[PDB]
Scaffold this motif. Structure first.
Motif, PDB file in Angstrom:
ATOM      1  N   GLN A 305       0.604  -1.192  -0.054  1.00 17.67           N
ATOM      2  CA  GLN A 305       0.004  -0.041   0.043  1.00 17.67           C
ATOM      3  C   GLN A 305       0.852   1.140  -0.026  1.00 17.67           C
ATOM      4  O   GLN A 305       0.282   2.507   0.164  1.00 17.67           O
TER       5      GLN A 305
ATOM      6  N   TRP B   8      -5.115  -3.373   6.284  1.00 19.57           N
ATOM      7  CA  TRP B   8      -4.612  -2.282   5.624  1.00 19.57           C
ATOM      8  C   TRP B   8      -3.696  -2.249   4.230  1.00 19.57           C
ATOM      9  O   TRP B   8      -3.069  -1.318   3.885  1.00 19.57           O
ATOM     10  N   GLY B   9      -3.509  -3.667   3.884  1.00 20.26           N
ATOM     11  CA  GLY B   9      -2.957  -3.552   2.522  1.00 20.26           C
ATOM     12  C   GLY B   9      -3.757  -3.579   1.392  1.00 20.26           C
ATOM     13  O   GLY B   9      -3.522  -3.343   0.238  1.00 20.26           O
ATOM     14  N   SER B  10      -5.188  -3.532   1.565  1.00 21.83           N
ATOM     15  CA  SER B  10      -6.303  -3.649   0.493  1.00 21.83           C
ATOM     16  C   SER B  10      -7.412  -2.889   0.829  1.00 21.83           C
ATOM     17  O   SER B  10      -8.275  -3.003   0.164  1.00 21.83           O
TER      18      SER B  10
END
Ligand code: HEM
Ligand code: HEM
Ligand SMILES: C[C@H](O)[C@H](O)[C@H]1CNc2nc(N)[nH]c(=O)c2N1
Ligand SMILES: C[C@H](O)[C@H](O)[C@H]1CNc2nc(N)[nH]c(=O)c2N1
Ligand SMILES: NC(=[NH2+])NCCC[C@H](N)C(=O)O
Ligand SMILES: NC(=[NH2+])NCCC[C@H](N)C(=O)O
Ligand SMILES: [C-]#N
Ligand SMILES: [C-]#N
Ligand SMILES: [Zn+2]
Lengths: 419, 419
Positions: A305, B8-10
Motif C-alpha cells: 500500500q 491495511w494492505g487492501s
C-alpha cells in the motif's frame, strides 16, 4: 497484587504493578481481544462542543499535580499543597487551568514515556520542548513549525523535540495540523488508475489541491503544511525547501540501486496527535524523533500500500520473483534495508537499525520496571516488521495499557470541521 | 451488531459476528491487554477431583449437539431432537455422556478450525481421526501412537491426523502424554554449564532420565514416549527408530552448511493439549500437521533459547558478526531458511514456506467470514517470526476469542500427579 511477565529468551520474570494506574478501559472486551486493531476508540480522543466538565477535570488535574510533585527526588510538600489548592480554585472559578512551563515539560516526556507503541522511549528524558501556547494565528504556527523543523533536523544530527500549541478550551477554537506528519510526500491517483508517489496520502493530498495547493504530480513532492488556528479554517503553507533534508538511496554494492531513484526525508515527525495531561487536551503538538531503518526500508518502500518496490528490486537482483517459495522477498527486503542504513550514514543523518533499537528498548523496559514497576508496551508495534524473532523484543511478554499523560489519536480534522 | 476489521494492505473490511459465540472470558482485563502472554489461564484447562458438575455440563452438551446438527446442509430435526433428549437423559442419569464417532470427528475439526494460533487451518476439513477412546493400558496407547506416527509420516507425504484417547471422568484417571510433542530432541545440561541438544526440553529430558531412560547425551536424541493411562503412573516407551523420519540439513549453494551437522524430524506433533467439546474434556489427543519452514529454520535453530546457531552461520558466511548494525543476522537467518526448505524438498518431506502459508491463511480467513461471519485469530502467533510485514497476515486486523470445541493447554502433568 501484580502481573507476572516472562521473557522466553532468558527465562527472566518481571512484576507489573504500574498497570493499576490504568486510566479507563482499553479496547479488549471481557471475552474478545482487539489488540491488533490499529485505531481503536480507546486510543482516540475526539472533538468537543463544550468545555470539559469540572466534575471530571478537577480530579484529573489533581492526579497530574500529585504525579508531578511526586517525581522529584526530594519532595516539596509545601509547594505541592500550594499548587493543588491553586489549581483547584482556578478550575472552580475559571472552568479550567493553565500548566506551568515545568509541568508541561514533565508532561510531554511522561506522555512519551507512556507511549506503548514507541520503540525509542529510552530517550524519553531528552526532549526539546517548544512552548507555543502563546500562538494565535496560522502564520505564527507556521513559524513555530519551521523553527521546530530547523532545530530537529540540525543538519542531520537529529534532535528530538515537540511544539505545544494552545490547549483545547471549548473545542470550537482547536489548533490543528491537518497533516499526518510535518514532512510527507504527496500521492496522486492518475487518470489511468495508477498511483504516483505515496499512496498513503491520497485523501490528504487531494485535500491540499482543493485548498489551492498546486499539484506537481511528482513521485516525491513534499506536501504543504495545512494549519488550523483558533478553530479557524485551515491555511496552506509551503515548507521552505532549505528546511527539508532528504536522503537519496544507493546500495553499497549494487550500483543499480541508485537507478531506482528513491529518496526519503530525514525527519520523522508525527503532527496529528493529541497530548492529554491532567484533564487538559492539546490537539496540536507536533513532535519528532529520528528514524528506525525498517520504517523506510520495509514499510515505506515495501508495503504493498506504499511505494511497493519489492518486485522491482527482486528482478534487478535476478531472483525467482515468480516463485514465492524461493524466499526472494526475504533477500530483496534485506538489500533495501542495507541501502537505507548505508545512505543515511553516508550523508550523516541520524538513524538506527531495528536490532540495535530492539536491544535498546529492552534496556529501557528493564529500567522502567525497576523504576516504577511497569512499562506499557504494545508487542504488535514494538516488534520490527522483519526479523521479529531475531530481536529480543519478540520473546518478551508485555502488557498494554493507557496511562496519563498520553498521546491520543484524533479524528481527521476535515471530517469534524465546521467551515 | 458486529466488529469492523480492516486489512491495511487492501483497505478491505470484514464484519465479525462469530465473536458473540465467545465461550467465557479471554485474558485481557477491562483496562489492560495481556494479548502477548504465551500461556494465560484463559487458554488453559487444569486438573480435577470430581466429575464436571451437571449444572454446567448439561448446557454445554446441548450447545455442542445443536452445533453439530446445525452444520449439516440439510437439517435432520427429528434426529436432532432425539439426540438432545438422549444426551440430556444420559447426563442426568450417569453424570456424563459419550459422543458418537461422527460427533467426535466433527469436534476435532471444529476445534482445529477454532485454534486462533494455527496458521494452517485451511486444511481443517482434512483430518484423519483415530478413535482410541477404547484404550485402557499404557502399552495400548504406545501402540496407537506408533500407528499414528506411521500414518502421519507416510514416508514424507505428511498427512494430518489426531488420536483421541478416553475422555476425562472424575479427573483421577486421566490419560496423558507427558511429552511436549510426540517426537522431540533431548536437552542435557552438562557439568561445565553448557547445554547439549535442545535446551527447551531440559526439564522433561531430566524427567525421563529419572524414570529410567538412558541418556545418550547426543545433540539430536529422540526422547522417549512417557505415557499415562487411567491416572496410572507414567511408563517410558522408546519410539521405534524406523518410525522417526529425519531430514539432514544442507544448503543448495553453501557446501559448508552440511558440516554444521544439523537435522530435524519431519513430523510436528503436539502431544500435550486438551480437547474440549460439549463439556467433555480429552486430556490426551495427540495431533499433527506438517511443518512451516520458519518453525525449524528460525525458532528451532536460531532462537537463543534453542540451538542458537546464528552466530556460527554468520562467521561461516564471513559477515560482520560483531557489528549488529550490519544486519548480518538478517542475512544468515535467510540462508538457514533456504537450507531448511531445500532439505525437506530434496528428501521429499512435505513442508511449507511462511509466505505461501501466510497467503494460504488469508484465503481461509476470507472463507471463514464468508461462511460464519468470523475467524478467531491470534495476530501475534499468526505473523511469521521473520518477514512479518512482507506477509499479508501482518496488515490484517483480527480478533482473538475462545470458542468451543477448543484445544486448551494443560499444567505439566509431573506437577499435578499423585504418585
Ligand atoms: C529517539 C527517537 C525515536 C525513535 C527511534 C522512535 C521510534 C518510533 C517508531 C519506530 C515508531 C513506530 C512508527 C510507525 O510504526 O509508523 C514510534 C511510534 C511512536 N512514538 Fe516514537 N520514536 C522516537 C521519538 C519519539 C518522540 C520524541 C515521541 C514523543 C514525544 C514519540 C512518540 C511516539 C508515539 C506517540 C508513537 C505512536 C505513533 C503512532 O501511533 O502512529 N516517539 N516511535
Ligand atoms: C496442515 C498443517 C498444519 C500447519 C501448516 C500448521 C501450522 C501451525 C503453526 C506454524 C503453528 C505454530 C507452532 C509454534 O509456533 O510453535 C501451529 C499452531 C497450532 N496448530 Fe497448527 N498447523 C497444521 C495442522 C494442525 C492440526 C491438524 C491441528 C489440530 C487438529 C492444529 C492445531 C494447532 C494448535 C492447537 C496450535 C497451537 C499450538 C500451541 O499453542 O502450542 N494444527 N500450527
Ligand atoms: C493489523 C495490524 O495491527 C497492523 O498491520 C500493525 C502491526 N504492527 C505495526 N507496527 C508498527 N510499528 N507500525 C504499524 O503500522 C503496524 N501495523
Ligand atoms: C512473548 C510472545 O508472546 C512470544 O514470544 C510469542 C510471539 N509469537 C509467537 N508465534 C508463534 N507462532 N510461536 C511462538 O512461540 C510465539 N512466541
Ligand atoms: N521513528 C519515528 N519517530 N517514527 C515516526 C513515524 C514514521 C513513519 N514510520 C514513517 O515512515
Ligand atoms: N506446523 C506445526 N504443526 N507445528 C507444531 C509446533 C511445532 C514447533 N514449532 C516445533 O518446531
Ligand atoms: C516516534 N515518533
Ligand atoms: C499445528 N500444529
Ligand atoms: Zn487484549
Amino acid at each position: 497484587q501484580y502481573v507476572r511477565i516472562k521473557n522466553w529468551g532468558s527465562g527472566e520474570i518481571l512484576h507489573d504493578t504500574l498497570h493499576h494506574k490504568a486510566t479507563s478501559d482499553f479496547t479488549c472486551k471481557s471475552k474478545s481481544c482487539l489488540g491488533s486493531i490499529m485505531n481503536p476508540k480507546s486510543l482516540t480522543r475526539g472533538p468537543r462542543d463544550k468545555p470539559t466538565p469540572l466534575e471530571e477535570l478537577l480530579p484529573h488535574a489533581i492526579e497530574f499535580i500529585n504525579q508531578y510533585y511526586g517525581s522529584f527526588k526530594e519532595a516539596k510538600i509545601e509547594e505541592h499543597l500550594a499548587r493543588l489548592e491553586a489549581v483547584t480554585k482556578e478550575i472552580e472559578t475559571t472552568g479550567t487551568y493553565q500548566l506551568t512551563l515545568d509541568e508541561l515539560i514533565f508532561a510531554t516526556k511522561m506522555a512519551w514515556r507512556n507511549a506503548p507503541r514507541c520503540i525509542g522511549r529510552i530517550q524519553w528524558s531528552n526532549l526539546q520542548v517548544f512552548d507555543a501556547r502563546n500562538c494565535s494565528t496560522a502564520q505564527e504556527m507556521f513559524q513555530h513549525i519551521c523553527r521546530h523543523i530547523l532545530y530537529a533536523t540540525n543538519n542531520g544530527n537529529i534532535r528530538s523535540a515537540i511544539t505545544v500549541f494552545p490547549q483545547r478550551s471549548d473545542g470550537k477554537h482547536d489548533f490543528r495540523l491537518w497533516n499526518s506528519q510535518l514532512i510527507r510526500y504527496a500521492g496522486y491517483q492518475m487518470p489511468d488508475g495508477t498511483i504516483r508517489g505515496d499512496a498513503a496520502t491520497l485523501e490528504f493530498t487531494q485535500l491540499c489541491i482543493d485548498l489551492g495547493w498546486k499539484p506537481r504530480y511528482g513521485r516525491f513532492d513534499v506536501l504543504p503544511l495545512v494549519l488550523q488556528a483558533d478553530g479557524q479554517d485551515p491555511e496552506v503553507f509551503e515548507i521552505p525547501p532549505d528546511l527539508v533534508l532528504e536522503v537519496t538511496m544507493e546500495h553499497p554494492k549494487y550500483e543499480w540501486f541508485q537507478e531506482l531513484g528513491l529518496k526519503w526525508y530525514a525527519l520523522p515527525a508525527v503532527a496529528n496527535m493529541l497530548l492529554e495531561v491532567g484533564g487538559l487536551e492539546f490537539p496540536a503538538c507536533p513532535f519528532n524523533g529520528w528514524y528506525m531503518g525498517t520504517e523506510i526500508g520495509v514499510r515505506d518502500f515495501c508495503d504493498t500500500q506504499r511505494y511497493n518496490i519489492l518486485e522491482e528490486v527482486g528482478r534487478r537482483m535476478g531472483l525467482e520473483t515468480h516463485t514465492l517459495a524461493s524466499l526472494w522477498k526475504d533477500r530483496a527486503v534485506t538489500e533495501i534495508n542495507v541501502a537505507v542504513l548505508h545512505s543515511f550514514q553516508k550523508q550523516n543523518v541520524t538513524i538506527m537499525d531495528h536490532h540495535t533499537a530492539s536491544e535498546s528498548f529492552m534496556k529501557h523496559m528493564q529500567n522502567e520496571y525497576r523504576a516504577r514497576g511497569g512499562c506499557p508496551a504494545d508487542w504488535i508495534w514494538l516488534v520490527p516488521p522483519v526479523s521479529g524473532s531475531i530481536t529480543p523484543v519478540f520473546h518478551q511478554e508485555m502488557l498494554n495499557y493507557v496511562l496519563s499523560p498520553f498521546y491520543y489519536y484524533q479524528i481527521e480534522p476535515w471530517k469534524t470541521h465546521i467551515w
